[PDB]
Design a protein around this nucleic acid. Structure first.
Lengths: 87, 70, 66, 98, 129
RNA sequence: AAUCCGGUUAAUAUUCCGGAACCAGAAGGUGGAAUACGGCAACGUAAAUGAAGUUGGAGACGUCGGCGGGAGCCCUG
């Protein structure tokens, strides 16, 4: 409850909506950046651009995790290619 | 309540049927506030120039309900 | 003599540009950093000490015993 | 500025990127130069009346300009006195459309 | 001509070829920049059962010419060079979007010819992640 | 998921009145773009295809102590 002063000079206790929690990254678990921090229902009206980043896997994982995943995939591909050539 | 600072847009808003009535309130600062109530928002335009306000009142659509200061 | 660029950005800047002549990646360094250094070393025939300063990226040797 | 923040009208005459647009300081005309080599000339009358919206219509479409490296009209200048357009191309040629 | 991959920005995980290197530094990019043209939309797996218009639509590829830093890029062992890919990369094309658009159109046409000829298959095929 | 003010009774108010908004859902209509974008970057825009299948976040989280920010009450010119 939040106490406020009415224009009629009356003290009114008004309900306070719970602060929205920003979405968390899928891999790291840290909250995502560049998106509003509101309730799940409130964020629905936002557009796709306002809800997802302009990057691969944007809106589900952090950019640092994305770079790490890209690097890990490249290293795995190189190792698999070398292993295939050796075999 | 969405204040509008574009005179042409207000005239266009009055041109469309979305407008219901327009109230011209005379403030203490001698500024004419042309408040037009639409279906989804209240359009208020404050014009300090009396001649501009007089021109706006004269150029208002006939269908619009012009209201004096309440 | 062979000033080290040990760290995260300095080591990567020296290694990627080829400035780091000798690299001593310790066990505490990230495996991705070691793998990227291995990829960089393979592309330029660099010296990888690979020590068992997270990654000692020496720009040169000079008086170094290596 | 008195109509809306959004543009009052839009045009896509140029087949290439619209390089620049110029409005004559005195003559009620505007010119637009683009890398397509075609320059569009429009005549626009603006009235101070609230109910009189700006009436802008195209007047001419300049053509026959050389295009080099996908670049045509680069700089367009209007005469300070008459409705004369000075357009400089990528080849160093300046056309004065009087 | 060296094949490179972009691990940053919107064009993440996209293979590019260095048409003109700006690693020496520039006022616009005070770093090891590199203006390269890559492929964003890899051509689809065209089937002989599909129609000629269907085959071309699937085989259509969307190129992308951009300048990125050396750190943002990743060198690769493979490399592809084209006659039309040399000398067409310059600051004027970057400065003039119409020149850039023609550069993108020409690069896509060259890539489409490369895809049609069956060359640069690894580059033409999008990389998984 | 989504509403406040002022006024109104013998006994009623976030319900009634006057004024001003918000939510959800629904179709078609208009206009805009459409046949997505720039920055090394975090990120940003009026729009900016996505089946099956796969994944994640929020919802949805233990307790205590001190500090900072604000509000109100009280105090005071």
């Amino acid at each position: 409850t939040r106490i406020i002063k009415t224009p009629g000079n009356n003290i009114r206790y008004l309900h306070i909506k719970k602060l929205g929690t920003i979405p968390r990254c899928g891999d790291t678990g840290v909250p995502l950046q560049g998106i509003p921090a509101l309730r799940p229902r409130e964020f629905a009206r936002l557009s796709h651009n306002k809800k997802t980043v302009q990057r691969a896997y944007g809106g589900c994982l952090s950019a640092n995790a994305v770079k790490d995943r890209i690097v890990r995939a490249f290293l795995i591909e190189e190792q698999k290619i070398v292993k295939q050539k050796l075999k | 309540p969405r204040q509008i600072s574009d005179i042409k847009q207000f005239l266009e808003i009055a041109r469309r049927k979305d407008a219901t009535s327009a109230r011209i309130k005379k403030n203490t600062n001698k500024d004419v506030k042309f408040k037009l109530r639409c279906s989804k928002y209240l359009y208020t335009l404050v014009v300090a120039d009396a001649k501009k306000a007089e021109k706006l009142r004269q150029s208002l659509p006939p269908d619009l309900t012009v209201t004096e200061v309440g | 003599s062979g000033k080290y660029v040990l760290g995260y950005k300095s080591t990567l800047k020296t290694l990627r540009s080829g400035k780091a002549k000798l690299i001593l990646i310790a066990a505490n360094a990230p495996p991705l950093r070691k793998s990227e250094l291995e990829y960089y070393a393979m592309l330029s025939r660099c010296s990888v000490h690979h020590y068992s300063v997270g990654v000692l990226a020496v720009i040169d040797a000079g008086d170094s015993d290596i | 500025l008195d109509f809306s923040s959004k543009p009052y009208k839009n045009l896509r005459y140029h087949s290439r990127a619209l390089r620049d647009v110029s409005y004559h300081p005195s003559l009620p005309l505007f010119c637009s130069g683009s890398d397509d080599g075609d320059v569009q000339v429009f005549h626009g009358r603006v009235y101070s009346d609230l109910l009189a919206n700006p009436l802008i219509v195209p007047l001419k479409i300049l053509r026959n300009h050389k295009v080099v490296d996908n670049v045509g009209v680069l700089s367009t200048c209007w005469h300070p006195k008459e409705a004369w357009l000075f357009s400089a191309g990528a080849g160093g040629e300046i056309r004065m459309w009087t | 001509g060296k094949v490179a991959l972009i691990t940053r920005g919107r064009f993440a995980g996209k293979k590019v070829v260095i048409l003109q290197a700006i690693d020496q530094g520039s006022k616009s990019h005070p770093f090891g920049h590199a203006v390269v043209a890559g492929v964003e939309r890899y051509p689809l797996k065209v089937t002989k059962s599909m129609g000629a218009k269907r085959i071309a639509r699937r085989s259509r590829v969307k190129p992308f010419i951009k300048v990125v830093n050396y750190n943002h890029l990743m060198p690769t062992r493979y490399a592809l060079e084209l006659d039309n890919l040399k000398g067409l990369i310059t600051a004027d094309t970057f400065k003039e979007p119409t020149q850039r658009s023609a550069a993108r159109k020409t690069v896509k046409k060259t890539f489409e010819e490369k895809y049609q000829s069956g060359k640069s298959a690894w580059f033409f095929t999008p990389l998984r992640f």
